[PDB]
mmCIF file with all atom_site columns, C-alpha atoms in Angstrom:
data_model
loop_
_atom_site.group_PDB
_atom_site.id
_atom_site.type_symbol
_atom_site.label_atom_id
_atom_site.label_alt_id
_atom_site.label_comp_id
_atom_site.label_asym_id
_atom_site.label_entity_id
_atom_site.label_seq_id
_atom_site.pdbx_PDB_ins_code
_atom_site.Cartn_x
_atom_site.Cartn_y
_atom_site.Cartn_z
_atom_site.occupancy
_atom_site.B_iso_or_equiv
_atom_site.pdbx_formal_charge
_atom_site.auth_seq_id
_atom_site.auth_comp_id
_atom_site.auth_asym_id
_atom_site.auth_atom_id
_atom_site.pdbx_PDB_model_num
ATOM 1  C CA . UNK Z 1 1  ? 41.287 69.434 -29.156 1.00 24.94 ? 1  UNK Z CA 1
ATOM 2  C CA . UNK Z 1 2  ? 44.423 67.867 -29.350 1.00 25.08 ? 2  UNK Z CA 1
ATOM 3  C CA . UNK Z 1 3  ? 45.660 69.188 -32.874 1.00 25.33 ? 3  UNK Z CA 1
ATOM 4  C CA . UNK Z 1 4  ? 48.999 70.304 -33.893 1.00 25.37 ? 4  UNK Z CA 1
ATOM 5  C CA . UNK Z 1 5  ? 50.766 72.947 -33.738 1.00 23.87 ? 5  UNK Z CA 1
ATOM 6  C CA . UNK Z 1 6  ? 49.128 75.724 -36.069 1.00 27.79 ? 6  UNK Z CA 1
ATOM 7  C CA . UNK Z 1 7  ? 46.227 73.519 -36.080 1.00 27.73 ? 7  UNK Z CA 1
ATOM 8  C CA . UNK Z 1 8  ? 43.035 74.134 -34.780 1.00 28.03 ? 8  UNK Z CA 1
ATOM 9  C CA . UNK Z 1 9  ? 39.874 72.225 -34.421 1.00 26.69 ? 9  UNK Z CA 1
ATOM 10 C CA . UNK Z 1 10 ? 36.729 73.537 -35.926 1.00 26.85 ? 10 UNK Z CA 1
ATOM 11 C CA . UNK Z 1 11 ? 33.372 71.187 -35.678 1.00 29.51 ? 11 UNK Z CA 1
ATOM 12 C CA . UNK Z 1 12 ? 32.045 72.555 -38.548 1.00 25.92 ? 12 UNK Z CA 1
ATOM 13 C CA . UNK Z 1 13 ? 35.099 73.681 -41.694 1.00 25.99 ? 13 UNK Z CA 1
ATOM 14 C CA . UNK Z 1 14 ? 35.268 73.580 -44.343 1.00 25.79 ? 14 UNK Z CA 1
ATOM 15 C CA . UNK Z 1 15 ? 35.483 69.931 -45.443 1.00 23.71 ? 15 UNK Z CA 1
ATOM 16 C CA . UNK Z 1 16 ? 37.037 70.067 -48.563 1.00 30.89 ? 16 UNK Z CA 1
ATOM 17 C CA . UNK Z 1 17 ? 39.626 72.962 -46.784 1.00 30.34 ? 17 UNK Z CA 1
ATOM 18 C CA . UNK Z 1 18 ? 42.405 73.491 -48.735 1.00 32.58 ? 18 UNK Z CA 1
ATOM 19 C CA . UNK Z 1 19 ? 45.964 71.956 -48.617 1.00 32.69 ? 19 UNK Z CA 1
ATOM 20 C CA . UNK Z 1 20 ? 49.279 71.298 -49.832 1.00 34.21 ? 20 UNK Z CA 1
ATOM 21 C CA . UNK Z 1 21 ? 47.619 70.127 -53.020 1.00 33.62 ? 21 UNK Z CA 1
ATOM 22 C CA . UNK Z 1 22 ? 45.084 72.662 -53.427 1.00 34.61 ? 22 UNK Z CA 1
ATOM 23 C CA . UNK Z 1 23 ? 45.414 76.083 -52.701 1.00 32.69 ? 23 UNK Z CA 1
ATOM 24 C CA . UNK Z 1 24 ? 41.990 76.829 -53.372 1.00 31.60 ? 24 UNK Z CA 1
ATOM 25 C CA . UNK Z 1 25 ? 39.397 75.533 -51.559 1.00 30.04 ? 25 UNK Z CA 1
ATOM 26 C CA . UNK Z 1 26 ? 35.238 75.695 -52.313 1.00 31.91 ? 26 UNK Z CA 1
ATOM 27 C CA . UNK Z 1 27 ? 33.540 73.258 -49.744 1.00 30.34 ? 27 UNK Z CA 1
ATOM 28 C CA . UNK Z 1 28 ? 33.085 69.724 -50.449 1.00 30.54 ? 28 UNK Z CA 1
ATOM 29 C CA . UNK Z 1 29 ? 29.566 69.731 -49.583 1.00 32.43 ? 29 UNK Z CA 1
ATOM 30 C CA . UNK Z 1 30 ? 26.401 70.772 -47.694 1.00 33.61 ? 30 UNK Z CA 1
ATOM 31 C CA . UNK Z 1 31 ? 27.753 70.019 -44.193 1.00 32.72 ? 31 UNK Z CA 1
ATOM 32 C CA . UNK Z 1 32 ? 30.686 71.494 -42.479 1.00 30.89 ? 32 UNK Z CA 1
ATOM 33 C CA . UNK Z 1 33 ? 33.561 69.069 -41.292 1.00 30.61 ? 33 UNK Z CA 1
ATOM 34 C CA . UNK Z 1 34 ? 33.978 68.354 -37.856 1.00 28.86 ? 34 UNK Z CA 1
ATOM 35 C CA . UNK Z 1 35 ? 38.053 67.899 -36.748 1.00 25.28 ? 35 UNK Z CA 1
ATOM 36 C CA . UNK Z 1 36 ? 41.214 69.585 -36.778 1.00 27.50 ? 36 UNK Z CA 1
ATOM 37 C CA . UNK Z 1 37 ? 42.871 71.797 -39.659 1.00 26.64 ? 37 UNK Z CA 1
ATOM 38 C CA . UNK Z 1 38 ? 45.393 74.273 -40.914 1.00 26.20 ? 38 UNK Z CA 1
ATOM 39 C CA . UNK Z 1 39 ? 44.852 77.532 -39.424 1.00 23.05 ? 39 UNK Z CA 1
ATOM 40 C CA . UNK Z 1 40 ? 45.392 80.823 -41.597 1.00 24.04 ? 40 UNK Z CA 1
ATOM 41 C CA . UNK Z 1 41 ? 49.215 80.409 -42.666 1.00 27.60 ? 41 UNK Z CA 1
ATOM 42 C CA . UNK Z 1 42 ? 49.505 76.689 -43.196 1.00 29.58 ? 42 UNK Z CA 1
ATOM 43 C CA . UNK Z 1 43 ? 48.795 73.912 -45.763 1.00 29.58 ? 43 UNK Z CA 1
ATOM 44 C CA . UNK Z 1 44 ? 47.559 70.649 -44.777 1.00 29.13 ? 44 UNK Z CA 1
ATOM 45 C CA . UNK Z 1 45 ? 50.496 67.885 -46.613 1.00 30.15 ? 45 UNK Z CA 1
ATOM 46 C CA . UNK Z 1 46 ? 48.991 64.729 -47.106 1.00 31.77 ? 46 UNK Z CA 1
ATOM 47 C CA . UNK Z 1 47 ? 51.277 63.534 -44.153 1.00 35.03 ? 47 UNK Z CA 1
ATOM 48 C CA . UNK Z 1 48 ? 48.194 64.972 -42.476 1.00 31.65 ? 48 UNK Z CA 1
ATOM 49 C CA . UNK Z 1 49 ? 50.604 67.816 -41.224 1.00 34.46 ? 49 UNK Z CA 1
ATOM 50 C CA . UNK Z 1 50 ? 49.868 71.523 -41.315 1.00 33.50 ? 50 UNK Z CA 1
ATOM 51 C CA . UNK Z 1 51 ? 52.778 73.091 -42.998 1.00 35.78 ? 51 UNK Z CA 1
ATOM 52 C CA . UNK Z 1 52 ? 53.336 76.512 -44.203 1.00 33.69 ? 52 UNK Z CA 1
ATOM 53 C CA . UNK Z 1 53 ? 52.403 76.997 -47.757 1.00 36.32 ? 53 UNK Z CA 1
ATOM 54 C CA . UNK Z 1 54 ? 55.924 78.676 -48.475 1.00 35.20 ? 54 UNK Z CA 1
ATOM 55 C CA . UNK Z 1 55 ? 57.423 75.530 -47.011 1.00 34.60 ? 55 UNK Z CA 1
ATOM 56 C CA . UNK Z 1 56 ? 55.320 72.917 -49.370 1.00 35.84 ? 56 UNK Z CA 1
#
């Protein structure tokens, strides 16, 4: 696991977690996502970078 900082990896999350773009997130479908993401505090930008949601 070689994420980010505030990242972490998770090999099953949910895949259609939510971001920059949307704050709410509901699965994307019946399978988890394997790969890193935006721990509790941050917002995936679609520079693939976990920023702070107060910072989008």
């Amino acid at each position: 696991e070689e994420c980010g900082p505030n990242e972490v990896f998770n090999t099953c999350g949910s895949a259609c977690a939510p971001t920059c773009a949307q704050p709410k997130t509901r699965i994307c479908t019946m399978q988890c996502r394997i790969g890193c993401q935006c721990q509790e505090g941050f917002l995936r930008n679609g520079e693939g970078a976990c920023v702070l949601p107060e910072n989008c």
